[PDB]
Nucleic acid binder design. Structure first.
Ligand SMILES: [Mg+2]
Ligand SMILES: [Mg+2]
Ligand SMILES: [Mg+2]
Ligand SMILES: [Mg+2]
Ligand SMILES: [Mg+2]
Ligand SMILES: [Mg+2]
Ligand SMILES: [Mg+2]
Ligand SMILES: [Mg+2]
Ligand SMILES: [Mg+2]
Ligand SMILES: [Mg+2]
Ligand SMILES: [Mg+2]
Ligand SMILES: [Mg+2]
Ligand SMILES: [Mg+2]
Ligand SMILES: [Mg+2]
Ligand SMILES: [Mg+2]
Ligand SMILES: [Mg+2]
Ligand SMILES: [Mg+2]
Ligand SMILES: [Mg+2]
Ligand SMILES: [Mg+2]
Ligand SMILES: [Mg+2]
Ligand SMILES: [Mg+2]
Ligand SMILES: [Mg+2]
Ligand SMILES: [Mg+2]
Ligand SMILES: [Mg+2]
Ligand SMILES: [Mg+2]
Ligand SMILES: [Mg+2]
Ligand SMILES: [Mg+2]
Ligand SMILES: [Mg+2]
Ligand SMILES: [Mg+2]
Ligand SMILES: [Mg+2]
Ligand SMILES: [Mg+2]
Ligand SMILES: [Mg+2]
Ligand SMILES: [Mg+2]
Ligand SMILES: [Mg+2]
Ligand SMILES: [Mg+2]
Ligand SMILES: [Mg+2]
Ligand SMILES: [Mg+2]
Ligand SMILES: [Mg+2]
Ligand SMILES: [Mg+2]
Ligand SMILES: [Mg+2]
Ligand SMILES: [Mg+2]
Ligand SMILES: [Mg+2]
Ligand SMILES: [Mg+2]
Ligand SMILES: [Mg+2]
Ligand SMILES: [Mg+2]
Ligand SMILES: [Mg+2]
Ligand SMILES: [Mg+2]
Ligand SMILES: [Mg+2]
Ligand SMILES: [Mg+2]
Ligand SMILES: [Mg+2]
Ligand SMILES: [Mg+2]
Ligand SMILES: [Mg+2]
Ligand SMILES: [Mg+2]
Ligand SMILES: [Mg+2]
Ligand SMILES: [Mg+2]
Ligand SMILES: [Mg+2]
Ligand SMILES: [Mg+2]
Ligand SMILES: [Mg+2]
Ligand SMILES: [Mg+2]
Ligand SMILES: [Mg+2]
Ligand SMILES: [Mg+2]
Ligand SMILES: [Mg+2]
Ligand SMILES: [Mg+2]
Ligand SMILES: [Mg+2]
Ligand SMILES: [Mg+2]
Ligand SMILES: [Mg+2]
Ligand SMILES: [Mg+2]
Ligand SMILES: [Mg+2]
Ligand SMILES: [Mg+2]
Ligand SMILES: [Mg+2]
Ligand SMILES: [Mg+2]
Ligand SMILES: [Mg+2]
Ligand SMILES: [Mg+2]
Ligand SMILES: [Mg+2]
Ligand SMILES: [Mg+2]
Ligand SMILES: [Mg+2]
Ligand SMILES: [Mg+2]
Ligand SMILES: [Mg+2]
Ligand SMILES: [Mg+2]
Ligand SMILES: [Mg+2]
Ligand SMILES: [Mg+2]
Ligand SMILES: [Mg+2]
Ligand SMILES: [Mg+2]
Ligand SMILES: [Mg+2]
Ligand SMILES: [Mg+2]
Ligand SMILES: [Mg+2]
Ligand SMILES: [Mg+2]
Ligand SMILES: [Mg+2]
Ligand SMILES: [Mg+2]
Ligand SMILES: [Mg+2]
Ligand SMILES: [Mg+2]
Ligand SMILES: [Mg+2]
Ligand SMILES: [Mg+2]
Ligand SMILES: [Mg+2]
Ligand SMILES: [Mg+2]
Ligand SMILES: [Mg+2]
Ligand SMILES: [Mg+2]
Ligand SMILES: [Mg+2]
Ligand SMILES: [Mg+2]
Ligand SMILES: [Mg+2]
Ligand SMILES: [Mg+2]
Ligand SMILES: [Mg+2]
Ligand SMILES: [Mg+2]
Ligand SMILES: [Mg+2]
Ligand SMILES: [Mg+2]
Ligand SMILES: [Mg+2]
Ligand SMILES: [Mg+2]
Ligand SMILES: [Mg+2]
Ligand SMILES: [Mg+2]
Ligand SMILES: [Mg+2]
Ligand SMILES: [Mg+2]
Ligand SMILES: [Mg+2]
Ligand SMILES: [Mg+2]
Ligand SMILES: [Mg+2]
Ligand SMILES: [Mg+2]
Ligand SMILES: [Mg+2]
Ligand SMILES: [Mg+2]
Ligand SMILES: [Mg+2]
Ligand SMILES: [Mg+2]
Ligand SMILES: [Mg+2]
Ligand SMILES: [Mg+2]
Ligand SMILES: [Mg+2]
Ligand SMILES: [Mg+2]
Ligand SMILES: [Mg+2]
Ligand SMILES: [Mg+2]
Ligand SMILES: [Mg+2]
Ligand SMILES: [Mg+2]
Ligand SMILES: [Mg+2]
Ligand SMILES: [Mg+2]
Ligand SMILES: [Mg+2]
Ligand SMILES: [Mg+2]
Ligand SMILES: [Mg+2]
Ligand SMILES: [Mg+2]
Ligand SMILES: [Mg+2]
Ligand SMILES: [Mg+2]
Ligand SMILES: [Mg+2]
Ligand SMILES: [Mg+2]
Ligand SMILES: [Mg+2]
Ligand SMILES: [Mg+2]
Ligand SMILES: [Mg+2]
Ligand SMILES: [Mg+2]
Ligand SMILES: [Mg+2]
Ligand SMILES: [Mg+2]
Ligand SMILES: [Mg+2]
Ligand SMILES: [Mg+2]
Ligand SMILES: [Mg+2]
Ligand SMILES: [Mg+2]
Ligand SMILES: [Mg+2]
Ligand SMILES: [Mg+2]
Ligand SMILES: [Mg+2]
Ligand SMILES: [Mg+2]
Ligand SMILES: [Mg+2]
Ligand SMILES: [Mg+2]
Ligand SMILES: [Mg+2]
Ligand SMILES: [Mg+2]
Ligand SMILES: [Mg+2]
Ligand SMILES: [Mg+2]
Ligand SMILES: [Mg+2]
Ligand SMILES: [Mg+2]
Ligand SMILES: [Mg+2]
Ligand SMILES: [Mg+2]
Ligand SMILES: [Mg+2]
Ligand SMILES: [Mg+2]
Ligand SMILES: [Mg+2]
Ligand SMILES: [Mg+2]
Ligand SMILES: [Mg+2]
Ligand SMILES: [Mg+2]
Ligand SMILES: [Mg+2]
Ligand SMILES: [Mg+2]
Ligand SMILES: [Mg+2]
Ligand SMILES: [Mg+2]
Ligand SMILES: [Mg+2]
Ligand SMILES: [Mg+2]
Ligand SMILES: [Mg+2]
Ligand SMILES: [Mg+2]
Ligand SMILES: [Mg+2]
Ligand SMILES: [Mg+2]
Ligand SMILES: [Mg+2]
Ligand SMILES: [Mg+2]
Ligand SMILES: [Mg+2]
Ligand SMILES: [Mg+2]
Ligand SMILES: [Mg+2]
Ligand SMILES: [Mg+2]
Ligand SMILES: [Mg+2]
Ligand SMILES: [Mg+2]
Ligand SMILES: [Mg+2]
Ligand SMILES: [Mg+2]
Ligand SMILES: [Mg+2]
Ligand SMILES: [Mg+2]
Ligand SMILES: [Mg+2]
Ligand SMILES: [Mg+2]
Ligand SMILES: [Mg+2]
Ligand SMILES: [Mg+2]
Ligand SMILES: [Mg+2]
Ligand SMILES: [Mg+2]
Ligand SMILES: [Mg+2]
Ligand SMILES: [Mg+2]
Ligand SMILES: [Mg+2]
Ligand SMILES: [Mg+2]
Ligand SMILES: [Mg+2]
Ligand SMILES: [Mg+2]
Ligand SMILES: [Mg+2]
Ligand SMILES: [Mg+2]
Ligand SMILES: [Mg+2]
Ligand SMILES: [Mg+2]
Ligand SMILES: [Mg+2]
Ligand SMILES: [Mg+2]
Ligand SMILES: [Mg+2]
Ligand SMILES: [Mg+2]
Ligand SMILES: [Mg+2]
Ligand SMILES: [Mg+2]
Ligand SMILES: [Mg+2]
Ligand SMILES: [Mg+2]
Ligand SMILES: [Mg+2]
Ligand SMILES: [Mg+2]
Ligand SMILES: [Mg+2]
Ligand SMILES: [Mg+2]
Ligand SMILES: [Mg+2]
Ligand SMILES: [Mg+2]
Ligand SMILES: [Mg+2]
Ligand SMILES: [Mg+2]
Ligand SMILES: [Mg+2]
Ligand SMILES: [Mg+2]
Ligand SMILES: [Mg+2]
Ligand SMILES: [Mg+2]
Ligand SMILES: [Mg+2]
Lengths: 189, 110, 59, 77, 141, 72
RNA sequence: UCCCCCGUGCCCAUAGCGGCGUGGAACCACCCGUUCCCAUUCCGAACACGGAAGUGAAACGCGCCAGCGCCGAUGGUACUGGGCGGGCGACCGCCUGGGAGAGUAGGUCGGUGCGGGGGA
RNA sequence: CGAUCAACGGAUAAAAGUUACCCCGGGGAUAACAGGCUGAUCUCCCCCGAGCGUCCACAGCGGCGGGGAGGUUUGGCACCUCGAUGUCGGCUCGUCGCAUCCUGGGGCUGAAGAAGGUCCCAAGGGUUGGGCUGUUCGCCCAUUAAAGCGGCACGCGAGCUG
RNA sequence: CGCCUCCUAAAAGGUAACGGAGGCGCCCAAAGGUCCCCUCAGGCGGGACGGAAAUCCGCCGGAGAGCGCAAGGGUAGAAGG
RNA sequence: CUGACUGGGGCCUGUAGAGCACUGAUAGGGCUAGGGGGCCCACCAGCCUACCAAACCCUGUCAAACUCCGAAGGGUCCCAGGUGGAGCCUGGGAGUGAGGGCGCGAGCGAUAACGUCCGCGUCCGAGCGCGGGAACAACCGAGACCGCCAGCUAAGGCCCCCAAGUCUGGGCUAAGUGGUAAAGGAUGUGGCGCCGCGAAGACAGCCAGGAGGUGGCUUAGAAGCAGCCAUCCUUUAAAGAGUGCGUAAUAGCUCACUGGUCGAGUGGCGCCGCGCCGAAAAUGAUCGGGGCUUAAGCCCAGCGCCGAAGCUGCGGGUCUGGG
C-alpha cells in the first residue's frame, strides 16, 4: 500500500566505498530540492521489489524529515545485474506523471484455444495526483482471441487519472503458441 | 521556409557586405521610401533620410530623388563619401534608382 | 615552500618522456636528492615521475 | 585466388594550418579543406579549391556562428 | 536460420569483445531470460539449436523471444591455402554477445518449464549462462 | 553421404613425385559400408583436393547404383 | 531613459510547428489602376509604375497555450591520460587525475544593438 | 606537337623460349625431408538428452548444438640445419606408450545356459604362414587365444638391401 | 604495378599487408565569365487521352533533390534551374 | 637559452564510450499497401485470416567503410620553468637502409603459431656485463671507470641444498590441491545473508490407512502411467481422477497425504571462500631437488633480516667544468 525506507545524507564519500559497505548510493530531487542520499541495499531491495516505481516510498531522513517519493530511475550494473544507483522523486501536491500497474483480469478465449497472452505493457504512464494514486487498473482480456489486441484507448480509467501515452499504444496481444509441428517446415526452409 | 523576397534580399546584401564599404540600405513601402547608411562592422546607422521624415509629398519617383539628395547632404556633413548601394529585394529601377541617382547628385561616391 | 625529491626507482624501461622529466628535475642517479622550489612547472614534472620518486615538503 | 582491391589514393594532408592566436603573414594558408567546412571571415580569402588564406598580416581568430557555419578571421596587428 | 536479408558490405573486420553489454541487459518481453555470463561470437546454428531445444521442451504452447541476431559475417579461408591472397570467404554469421546480455526470453509457460527449457538451451551455447526472472528492476528500465 | 558409413584410408601415393611422395601421404580411399562401393583418388598432390574428388565420386556411385536398383 | 510600429543587425530553435486571441489613428500590408517606366518562356501572380475608395480576410506585428519540435541538470555509470595488479587466454580488476552518451528533474511559445516614425 | 615510355621516376631507337647435358657465386635471408611452434584438418574422449530401442531417454544407441585431450594425418608458419640433418618400402635388431587384439580381474546387460554386447581395472607375456603389388596400406587364401593401434629423425642405409 | 575516393588509421599530420569496397586515362564553346531572376526531392487531394511515374492545380516540405561520371566533403543566405 | 620534458591559456580533432537523427541491418507487436489462401462471384463488386508481408508506429537491438552525440588524450601557437653529451646554423667523416621479443592499439589469420603487417612504447640488438626468475638475448631488479676480507637497499627471498624468521596475529585447504586444462557432475568443507516447518509436536525412522463416480478428443481393445483438452467431487482424518513394477488385460508394492509414535531443532534459497571429479602418449622419474599438512600451501594484517657491478663509505684514474 505505502512503504517506508530509511535514507541518509551523503557528501564526499566515494560511491564505491558506500557500495562495498552495502549502501546503495542515490539522489532525491524535484524542482525545489536536490540532495545526495544513500539507502541500505538489502533494506531498499525488500521495499523496491514490492513498491517498484508504482507505489509511494516515504524516506525517513536522519534530520527528522519524511518525504514521499516515487522511484524515478534505477541504474543497473550491466555485468553483475545489480542496482548501483537510485533516483528518488520527491512528490508534492501537484499532479505527476507516473506508471500505474495494469492488472489483466480474465482468461482470454485465445488462451483457451492454446494461445499466449503477451502482456506488452505491465503498467501505463499517467498523470494523477499523489493523493490519488490507484493501486492497479483492471483490464478485461477474456474477449481476446488469437490474435486480437488491446490498446490504451480501451483502458477504463479511475477518477482523476489521465492517460499520458497515446491511446494508439497497444497494451496486450494474444499470440499463437510455439509448436513442434512447425519445426520440420522451418528446418527444410 | 524562406520566400523569394527573403532569398533575393539575403543574396544581394551578402554580396554587398563582403566588400566592407559603408552600406546604403533603401526601404521602399507602397507610400514612402527610406534610406539609412549602415556600418555593418559596428552594427550602427550613421545617417538617415526618408520621405516620411522630410514630409515629402508628390510623385513617388521625384520624391525618392529628393530623399536621396537629402541623405547625401547630411552624409557629406559627417565625412561619409564612399558607400555601397543596397537595393535589397528591389530591382535597380524606378523609385530605388531615383533615390540612388539623387544620392549620387549630392556627391555620394558609388 | 620547497620540495625534496629523491629518485628511488630506476627509469630504465620507462618511456623517454619520463626520462626527460627526471632530466628537467636534475635527477641523474638513484638515491639522489634535489631540493626544488615548489612551482607548478616543477610540480608537474615531479608528479609525472611520482612512481619513481619520493617527495617531501621542506621549510 | 586473388584480390580485386588493393587501391588507395595518396593522403591529401588536409586540415587547419594555422590555429587561433597564431601570427600569420598575408598569403599564409590557414585551412586546406574540401568544400566549406570553414568559411572565410574578415581579411580571409578563399581559393578555387576552398583553401582559406590570410589577406593581411595579423592574428588568426576562429568563430562558430551556429547555422551560419564556422568562420576564420584574421585580426590586423 | 537467422542471417541478414541483405547487407551493405559482405565482410566485416573481427573487432573486439571488451566490456559488458551495451544494452539488452534487462528482461523486456517474457517472464524468464537467459543471460550471457561470458563474451563470445554466438553462431546462427547455436542460436537455432537453443531455439529448437526450447520449442521441443514446450511441445506446444509458450512463446520464445530471441533477442540477439547474427548480423556479423564469419570468414574462413579455404582449407590448405597459405596466408595472403585476400580475405577468406563468408562461412556463417554470428551475433556478438557480451556479459549481461539477455539472449532469450520465454513466456506463457510455468516456472518449472521455463527453468528447464532455458537450462537445456544454455547447454547448446559456447558460454556460461544464468537464468533470470522478470523483476521490478527490469520493469523500471 | 552419411559419414557414419565411411571408412577413410589415408596412405602414401604411388609413382612420380619427390621426397614429398615418399614422406607426405595424401593417398585417399573411401569405403561406403552399406553398399560396399569403394573409391580411391590419387591425382593431385594434397589429400584434401584428393578427398574432395573421392567424396563426390563415392556419391556418384551410390546414386548410379540406387538408380540401377530402381529402374530394374 | 518608457510603450507601439518601421527599417537594419547580433545571439543561432529556450528563437521553431501548431492552436487561439489581438492590432489599422500611425506605420506596414493587402488594396485601387495598368496611362507612363518596367515586366510575364502565358498571366500586372511576380517584377514595376501611378494612386488612396476600402480591409486588417491574407501576410506581417504583438500576446497567450507545452500537443510536437528545441533546450536540459544534479546524481550514477561507460570510457580513459598517468600509475599498478590478475588471467593460459577471450579478457578482469585497483589507485590517481579527467569524464560522457542515453535517461530523469526541469526549461522554452525568444533575448538584445543601432537608426527612424509615433505615443507619454 | 609526337608517350597504354600503363613495369605509369620512364635501363636500348630496336628483343622470346628451353636445359634431366648443364656451370659458377651465394642463401637455411627461401622451398622439398626430419625436427620445432600451432592444432585448422586428423584420431580419441567427454557435455546436452531430441528421438530410437514392442513397453522403457541412457542394455545398446545419441538429432541439432556445446567443451576438451592427443600430437600418429594433411596443412599453416619459415625458427636450427643448403662450407649437406641421405629421402619410400623391405630386412635385421629392438625399446617404449596404452586410447587393450588375445590372455587375467570386474560392473551393467534387452546376462536362462553356452556365446555375445558395453564399460571399468590391467602393458606380464603373446600377437602365425601364404597369394597380389616396389609398396606402407589394402584385398584375398588357410589358420588362430588373438591375428592391437601408435612413438622412437612416420626408430634403425659410418647395419644390409635398393 | 600510375592516379582518385572511403575504411582499416589508434579524434592533428602521416602510417603497412596478395587487408575491405569503388572509380580514372574523360569530359563542356558552355557544362566557361558576369549581371538578373527562380527553388528541390517526396507525400496527400484534385485533374481528358494518361498508366506507379508525361504535363496541370492545391496543400503539406530545410533539404532526403540537384550539382556531367566513383566516393567523400560541401552546397538552396547556391555551388543547383 | 632558443632544447627534450613541464605549468597556464587559446584553437584544431571525430577515436573509446555511447546513440539510432541519417545510411543500412534487425527480432517481436501494432497499424496498414500489395500480393497469398479461403468465401460468394464472375453482374463487379462483396466478405476471412493464426500465410507472406512495404511504408509507418511501439517495444528491443546491431555497424570499420552509420553519427543526433562524444570523452580521456593528442597536436599546434603564445608566455613562463627548464644550462642539458640540450638546441639552432655552416661545413668534414660516417655507418645503417635483414631487425627481434615484450606491453598496449588494430588489420590479416582460426578471438592458431617462437605467425604475419602497421601504430605507440620499451628492451635486446650494441647491456650473451651484474641480482632475481632452477637453468634462459629482450619478464622483474638495475645502466658495470679501477681497488676494499666495510655499510644500506632493489626485485626476489629468509626449513635444508642456499645468505636471511622453522618470526608474530587471525582465517581457509586435506586435495601433496599447492606444483599445469574445459563443459559438466557431487551430502568434500567453510562463511555471510534471507525465507519455510516446528506442543490443533516438526524433519528422519518405525505403525495404521491411503478409498469411492472408477469413463473422455477415445483409440491398437491402456478410468489411472497410449498420445491429448480434461481437472468436476464425494463416503461426518477426509486419501492425486496419480512420480518409480503388470500392462495394445487385472493384480500388487510406493509416495504426496492423515493419524499413531518418541522430544529436539530441522529443511530451502541466495552471494562469497577453498578444495574433489572430468584428466590418456610414447628412454627414468621429480614442485629445481630434498622434503613440506594449525605448512615449508593459500588469503589477510605486521615487525625484522638476507640480498646486485644499484646507493653509501674510503682510496685512485681520466676527461669536462668551476675556482
Ligand atoms: Mg540482492
Ligand atoms: Mg624501474
Ligand atoms: Mg638510472
Ligand atoms: Mg624494469
Ligand atoms: Mg609516459
Ligand atoms: Mg607526450
Ligand atoms: Mg644510478
Ligand atoms: Mg621511497
Ligand atoms: Mg583481381
Ligand atoms: Mg586494399
Ligand atoms: Mg594502385
Ligand atoms: Mg596509403
Ligand atoms: Mg600518402
Ligand atoms: Mg587517402
Ligand atoms: Mg583541422
Ligand atoms: Mg572580427
Ligand atoms: Mg582569387
Ligand atoms: Mg572552382
Ligand atoms: Mg574567441
Ligand atoms: Mg583481426
Ligand atoms: Mg567461433
Ligand atoms: Mg574469421
Ligand atoms: Mg598449400
Ligand atoms: Mg588474407
Ligand atoms: Mg578469413
Ligand atoms: Mg559458422
Ligand atoms: Mg551483447
Ligand atoms: Mg554452456
Ligand atoms: Mg533504454
Ligand atoms: Mg609405379
Ligand atoms: Mg610432407
Ligand atoms: Mg610427414
Ligand atoms: Mg523591426
Ligand atoms: Mg504560432
Ligand atoms: Mg481582428
Ligand atoms: Mg495572427
Ligand atoms: Mg488603414
Ligand atoms: Mg478604420
Ligand atoms: Mg501617361
Ligand atoms: Mg496588380
Ligand atoms: Mg508589388
Ligand atoms: Mg486608391
Ligand atoms: Mg488577420
Ligand atoms: Mg512580406
Ligand atoms: Mg509557460
Ligand atoms: Mg541528456
Ligand atoms: Mg555527471
Ligand atoms: Mg592504462
Ligand atoms: Mg588485450
Ligand atoms: Mg578513475
Ligand atoms: Mg576523479
Ligand atoms: Mg562520451
Ligand atoms: Mg548528459
Ligand atoms: Mg516555443
Ligand atoms: Mg530583432
Ligand atoms: Mg551588435
Ligand atoms: Mg528603438
Ligand atoms: Mg523612437
Ligand atoms: Mg615518342
Ligand atoms: Mg589497369
Ligand atoms: Mg618499373
Ligand atoms: Mg619498360
Ligand atoms: Mg602516368
Ligand atoms: Mg616505377
Ligand atoms: Mg611517385
Ligand atoms: Mg633513358
Ligand atoms: Mg629510352
Ligand atoms: Mg627512333
Ligand atoms: Mg623491353
Ligand atoms: Mg638463354
Ligand atoms: Mg631431357
Ligand atoms: Mg625430360
Ligand atoms: Mg632423357
Ligand atoms: Mg647427355
Ligand atoms: Mg654429357
Ligand atoms: Mg640427350
Ligand atoms: Mg655445361
Ligand atoms: Mg654451386
Ligand atoms: Mg657472381
Ligand atoms: Mg658457391
Ligand atoms: Mg628452415
Ligand atoms: Mg627475400
Ligand atoms: Mg623449409
Ligand atoms: Mg627445408
Ligand atoms: Mg620441408
Ligand atoms: Mg611441407
Ligand atoms: Mg629424418
Ligand atoms: Mg617441414
Ligand atoms: Mg633438426
Ligand atoms: Mg625431436
Ligand atoms: Mg608443438
Ligand atoms: Mg587439440
Ligand atoms: Mg592442443
Ligand atoms: Mg580440431
Ligand atoms: Mg575427455
Ligand atoms: Mg545425460
Ligand atoms: Mg518409442
Ligand atoms: Mg529401459
Ligand atoms: Mg522420448
Ligand atoms: Mg554426433
Ligand atoms: Mg571446440
Ligand atoms: Mg609431432
Ligand atoms: Mg608429426
Ligand atoms: Mg607445412
Ligand atoms: Mg608438421
Ligand atoms: Mg608452408
Ligand atoms: Mg624454414
Ligand atoms: Mg629459416
Ligand atoms: Mg619473419
Ligand atoms: Mg640443407
Ligand atoms: Mg664441412
Ligand atoms: Mg659442417
Ligand atoms: Mg659435409
Ligand atoms: Mg656430415
Ligand atoms: Mg614398435
Ligand atoms: Mg586403460
Ligand atoms: Mg581381457
Ligand atoms: Mg574376460
Ligand atoms: Mg538372450
Ligand atoms: Mg540366450
Ligand atoms: Mg554367460
Ligand atoms: Mg563383460
Ligand atoms: Mg564400467
Ligand atoms: Mg567401473
Ligand atoms: Mg601387456
Ligand atoms: Mg613392456
Ligand atoms: Mg604389446
Ligand atoms: Mg600377414
Ligand atoms: Mg607364384
Ligand atoms: Mg609378398
Ligand atoms: Mg603388400
Ligand atoms: Mg611379385
Ligand atoms: Mg594400396
Ligand atoms: Mg579392392
Ligand atoms: Mg578357431
Ligand atoms: Mg576367446
Ligand atoms: Mg610425418
Ligand atoms: Mg613411428
Ligand atoms: Mg615405418
Ligand atoms: Mg625413417
Ligand atoms: Mg631409415
Ligand atoms: Mg648405403
Ligand atoms: Mg632405406
Ligand atoms: Mg645411421
Ligand atoms: Mg652415417
Ligand atoms: Mg651407423
Ligand atoms: Mg650417422
Ligand atoms: Mg631391396
Ligand atoms: Mg633404382
Ligand atoms: Mg588516416
Ligand atoms: Mg583517419
Ligand atoms: Mg589521423
Ligand atoms: Mg592519433
Ligand atoms: Mg580497376
Ligand atoms: Mg547560357
Ligand atoms: Mg550566363
Ligand atoms: Mg511536389
Ligand atoms: Mg495524382
Ligand atoms: Mg485519368
Ligand atoms: Mg497523374
Ligand atoms: Mg544531395
Ligand atoms: Mg558513375
Ligand atoms: Mg631558458
Ligand atoms: Mg618552443
Ligand atoms: Mg617547447
Ligand atoms: Mg605544455
Ligand atoms: Mg564502439
Ligand atoms: Mg538507425
Ligand atoms: Mg529510441
Ligand atoms: Mg562495436
Ligand atoms: Mg556501436
Ligand atoms: Mg571508422
Ligand atoms: Mg565508429
Ligand atoms: Mg549533447
Ligand atoms: Mg583536448
Ligand atoms: Mg594546449
Ligand atoms: Mg624559458
Ligand atoms: Mg653548450
Ligand atoms: Mg648524447
Ligand atoms: Mg646528442
Ligand atoms: Mg672526420
Ligand atoms: Mg674520416
Ligand atoms: Mg646499409
Ligand atoms: Mg650508405
Ligand atoms: Mg633495401
Ligand atoms: Mg628480416
Ligand atoms: Mg627493410
Ligand atoms: Mg618492423
Ligand atoms: Mg619487415
Ligand atoms: Mg607485442
Ligand atoms: Mg597489463
Ligand atoms: Mg588496422
Ligand atoms: Mg615474429
Ligand atoms: Mg603473438
Ligand atoms: Mg597477433
Ligand atoms: Mg619493437
Ligand atoms: Mg647486427
Ligand atoms: Mg637489460
Ligand atoms: Mg640499450
Ligand atoms: Mg641481459
Ligand atoms: Mg644474456
Ligand atoms: Mg651469471
Ligand atoms: Mg638474467
Ligand atoms: Mg638467473
Ligand atoms: Mg639461481
Ligand atoms: Mg634469460
Ligand atoms: Mg656508467
Ligand atoms: Mg641490511
Ligand atoms: Mg627458494
Ligand atoms: Mg642458512
Ligand atoms: Mg615473511
Ligand atoms: Mg610459524
Ligand atoms: Mg604436489
Ligand atoms: Mg600436481
Ligand atoms: Mg565452473
Ligand atoms: Mg491404484
Ligand atoms: Mg487419460
Ligand atoms: Mg561451495
Ligand atoms: Mg582433475
Ligand atoms: Mg586425480
Ligand atoms: Mg597462522
Ligand atoms: Mg649487498
Ligand atoms: Mg656505480
Ligand atoms: Mg672518490
Ligand atoms: Mg672523477
Ligand atoms: Mg667527458
Amino acid at each position: 500500500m505505502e512503504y517506508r525506507l530509511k535514507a541518509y545524507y551523503r557528501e564526499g564519500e566515494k560511491p564505491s566505498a558506500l557500495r562495498r559497505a552495502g549502501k546503495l548510493p542515490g539522489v532525491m530531487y524535484n524542482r525545489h530540492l536536490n540532495r545526495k542520499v544513500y539507502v541500505d541495499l538489502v533494506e531498499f531491495d525488500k521495499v523496491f521489489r514490492q513498491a517498484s516505481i508504482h507505489h509511494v516510498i516515504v524516506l525517513e531522513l536522519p534530520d527528522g524529515q519524511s518525504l514521499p517519493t516515487l522511484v524515478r530511475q534505477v541504474n543497473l550494473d550491466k555485468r553483475r545485474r545489480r542496482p548501483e544507483h537510485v533516483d528518488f522523486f520527491v512528490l508534492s501536491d501537484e499532479p505527476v506523471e507516473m506508471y500505474v500497474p495494469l492488472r489483466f483480469v480474465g482468461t482470454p478465449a485465445g488462451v483457451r484455444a492454446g494461445g499466449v497472452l503477451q502482456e506488452i505493457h505491465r503498467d501505463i504512464l499517467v498523470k494523477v495526483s499523489p493523493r490519488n494514486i490507484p493501486e492497479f487498473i483492471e483490464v478485461d482480456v477474456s474477449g481476446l482471441e488469437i490474435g486480437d489486441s488491446l490498446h490504451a484507448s480501451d483502458l477504463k480509467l479511475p477518477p482523476g487519472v489521465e492517460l499520458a501515452v497515446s491511446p494508439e499504444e497497444t497494451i496486450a496481444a494474444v499470440v499463437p503458441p510455439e509448436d513442434v509441428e512447425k519445426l520440420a517446415e522451418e528446418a527444410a526452409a | 521556409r524562406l520566400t523569394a523576397y527573403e532569398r533575393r534580399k539575403f543574396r544581394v546584401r551578402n554580396r554587398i557586405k563582403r566588400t566592407g564599404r559603408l552600406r546604403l540600405s533603401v526601404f521602399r513601402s507602397l507610400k514612402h521610401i527610406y534610406a539609412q547608411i549602415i556600418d555593418d562592422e559596428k552594427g550602427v546607422t550613421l545617417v538617415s533620410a526618408s520621405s516620411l521624415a522630410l514630409k515629402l509629398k508628390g510623385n513617388k519617383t521625384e520624391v525618392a530623388r529628393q530623399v536621396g539628395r537629402a541623405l547625401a547632404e547630411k552624409a557629406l556633413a559627417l565625412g561619409i563619401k564612399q558607400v555601397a548601394f543596397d537595393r535589397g529585394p528591389y530591382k535597380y529601377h524606378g523609385r530605388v534608382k531615383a533615390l540612388a541617382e539623387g544620392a549620387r547628385e549630392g556627391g555620394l561616391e558609388f | 615552500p620547497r620540495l625534496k625529491v629523491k629518485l628511488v626507482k630506476s627509469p630504465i624501461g620507462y618511456p623517454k618522456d619520463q626520462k626527460a622529466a627526471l632530466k628537467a628535475l636534475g635527477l641523474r642517479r638513484l638515491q639522489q636528492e634535489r631540493v626544488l622550489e615548489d612551482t607548478p612547472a616543477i610540480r608537474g614534472n615531479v608528479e609525472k615521475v611520482a612512481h619513481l620518486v619520493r617527495v617531501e615538503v621542506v621549510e | 585466388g586473388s584480390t580485386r582491391n588493393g587501391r588507395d589514393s595518396q593522403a591529401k594532408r588536409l586540415g587547419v594550418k594555422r590555429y587561433e592566436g597564431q601570427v600569420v603573414r598575408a598569403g599564409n594558408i590557414l585551412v586546406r579543406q574540401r568544400g566549406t567546412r570553414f568559411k572565410p571571415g574578415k581579411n580571409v580569402g578563399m581559393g578555387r579549391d576552398f583553401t582559406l588564406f590570410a589577406l593581411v598580416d595579423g592574428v588568426v581568430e576562429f568563430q562558430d556562428r551556429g547555422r551560419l557555419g564556422r568562420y576564420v578571421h584574421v585580426r590586423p596587428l | 536460420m537467422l542471417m541478414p536479408r541483405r547487407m551493405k558490405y559482405r565482410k566485416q573486420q573481427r573487432g573486439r569483445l571488451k566490456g559488458a553489454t551495451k544494452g539488452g541487459d534487462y528482461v523486456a518481453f517474457g517472464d524468464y531470460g537467459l543471460v550471457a555470463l561470458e563474451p563470445a561470437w554466438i553462431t546462427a546454428q547455436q542460436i537455432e539449436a537453443a531455439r529448437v531445444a526450447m520449442v521441443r521442451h514446450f511441445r506446444r504452447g509458450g512463446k520464445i523471444f530471441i533477442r540477439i541476431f547474427p548480423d556479423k559475417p564469419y570468414t574462413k579461408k579455404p582449407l590448405e591455402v597459405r596466408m595472403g591472397k585476400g580475405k577468406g570467404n563468408v562461412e556463417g554469421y554470428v551475433a556478438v554477445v557480451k556479459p549481461g546480455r539477455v539472449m532469450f526470453e520465454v513466456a506463457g509457460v510455468t516456472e518449472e518449464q521455463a527453468m528447464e527449457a532455458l537450462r537445456i538451451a544454455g547447454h547448446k551455447l559456447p558460454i556460461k549462462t544464468k537464468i533470470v526472472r522478470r523483476d521490478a528492476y527490469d520493469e523500471a528500465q | 553421404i552419411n559419414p557414419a558409413d565411411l571408412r577413410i584410408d589415408t596412405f602414401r601415393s604411388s609413382g612420380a613425385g619427390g621426397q614429398h611422395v615418399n614422406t607426405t601421404d595424401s593417398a585417399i580411399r573411401i569405403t561406403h559400408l552399406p553398399t560396399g562401393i569403394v573409391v580411391e583418388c590419387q591425382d593431385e598432390r594434397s589429400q584434401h583436393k584428393n578427398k574432395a574428388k573421392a567424396l563426390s565420386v563415392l556419391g556418384a556411385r551410390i546414386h548410379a547404383a540406387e538408380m540401377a536398383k530402381r529402374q530394374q
